[PDB]
């Protein structure tokens, strides 16, 4: 692949080559797609470069559209493209304007194709981070607004472009992404994706973390996304990937109003069923761990006295969860909460009133059930941990 003039007598690339010899040869495209040749160019562009050496790099790497795309989509050449882009942004000569303008036109015309490429998406991410904000926003304007935005959110490579936009681009320029994902036909299919749920979570985290107009923009975008999530949180909480979205909302104190809505309208009256779900049981745990004490008392009361026992065996909701493959983790969560509160590791005061007696009452009911079923529980690692948890508390 390498040109013959650059090879030694054995056929390998000549050691100690000058960067100027590669630039003046017209064979840079061969070096940039070769593992050894591109490692050479990567180190060369790290040192000091003359004025014309920079111009030669600008023209041969990011100056011609077809060569720029070929290197951006190459396993090796994409590193050189990012380096030359960085050098181009750090060189404030007279040609600075026309260079970034041509770079913008190259990326914008092939935005989606580069986003979905394993290597070209790195060029886009490094561009968004380092370019002029005015030029980086024009890359954002090249993102598709139609159904092709689904492909970008759920793609293994392109999803990292969206998350980079969320991190460094002002919300005004990517509010259309919030509107798109919040649409009912798009929320469940993106939140339930392995990579799309990372996009949604990153959007929520950014909208949670200037002017009153900027705050109004941030609040209305978060409100729209939260409304869509709460409207489908039952399907999202039981989902393999979307359950992380519900957990993050319940676990975030800055989203308190939405946590109580999820607890009030989705988890209440369904605690026994959701505790036996592979994915929703993690959501029930987070709800127990972060619910306000008034709602936490209603969750406790539902497990203890909210279900009619089995007319034959007499086992209630606590019995079913305690011996379920997933429900047992919810019971362990309730016990740990009560033991932490009694021993002074969890908050029991709200409104200037100490609710420690409520945690003592729930602890008594949990402790009495573990005692009643200690024979069976001592054969399970989950039962052993409940027994050990109560043993530590009675040591004190």
């Amino acid at each position: 692949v390498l040109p013959t003039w650059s090879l030694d007598s054995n056929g390998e690339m000549r050691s100690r080559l000058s960067l100027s010899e590669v630039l003046d040869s017209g064979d840079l495209m061969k070096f940039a797609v070769d593992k050894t040749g591109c490692q050479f160019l990567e180190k060369a562009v790290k040192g000091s470069l003359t004025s014309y050496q920079k111009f030669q790099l600008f023209e041969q790497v990011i100056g011609r559209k077809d060569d720029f795309l070929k290197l951006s989509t190459n396993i090796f050449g994409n590193y050189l493209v990012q380096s030359v882009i960085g050098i181009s942004l750090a060189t404030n000569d007279d040609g600075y304007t026309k260079r970034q303008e041509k770079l913008k036109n190259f990326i914008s015309s092939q935005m989606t194709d580069m986003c979905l490429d394993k290597f070209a998406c790195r060029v886009i991410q490094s561009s968004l981070q380092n370019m002029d904000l005015s030029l980086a926003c024009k890359l954002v304007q090249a993102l598709p607004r139609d159904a092709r935005l689904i492909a970008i959110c759920v793609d293994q490579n392109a999803n990292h472009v969206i998350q980079k936009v969320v991190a460094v681009i002002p919300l005004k320029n990517w509010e259309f992404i919030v509107d798109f994902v919040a649409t009912p036909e798009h929320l469940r299919q993106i939140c339930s994706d392995k990579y799309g749920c990372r996009v949604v979570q990153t959007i929520i985290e950014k909208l949670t973390a200037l002017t009153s107009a900027a705050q109004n923009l941030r609040e209305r975008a978060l409100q729209r996304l939260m409304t869509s999530v709460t409207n489908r949180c039952q399907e999202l909480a039981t989902n393999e990937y979307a359950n992380y979205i519900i957990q993050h909302i319940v676990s975030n104190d800055d989203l308190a109003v939405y946590r109580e809505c999820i607890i009030e309208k989705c988890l209440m009256r369904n605690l026994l069923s959701l505790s036996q779900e592979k994915f929703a049981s993690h959501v029930v745990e987070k709800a127990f761990l972060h619910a306000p004490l008034e709602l936490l008392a209603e969750m406790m009361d539902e497990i203890f006295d909210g279900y009619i026992p089995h007319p034959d065996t007499g086992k209630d909701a606590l019995d079913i969860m305690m011996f379920h493959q997933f429900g047992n983790y919810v019971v362990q969560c309730m016990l740990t909460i009560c033991c932490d509160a009694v021993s002074g590791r969890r908050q029991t005061k709200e409104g200037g009133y100490d609710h420690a007696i409520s945690f003592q009452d729930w602890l008594k009911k949990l402790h009495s059930r573990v005692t009643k079923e200690r024979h069976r529980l001592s054969r399970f690692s989950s039962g052993k941990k409940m027994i050990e948890t109560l043993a530590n508390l009675r040591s004190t």
Partner: peptide, 15 residues
């Protein structure tokens, strides 16, 4: 540990 989900009839808060 059980793998199948078991349901019990819900009881309203005011009942």
């Amino acid at each position: 540990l059980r793998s199948q989900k078991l349901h019990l009839t819900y009881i309203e808060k005011n009942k």
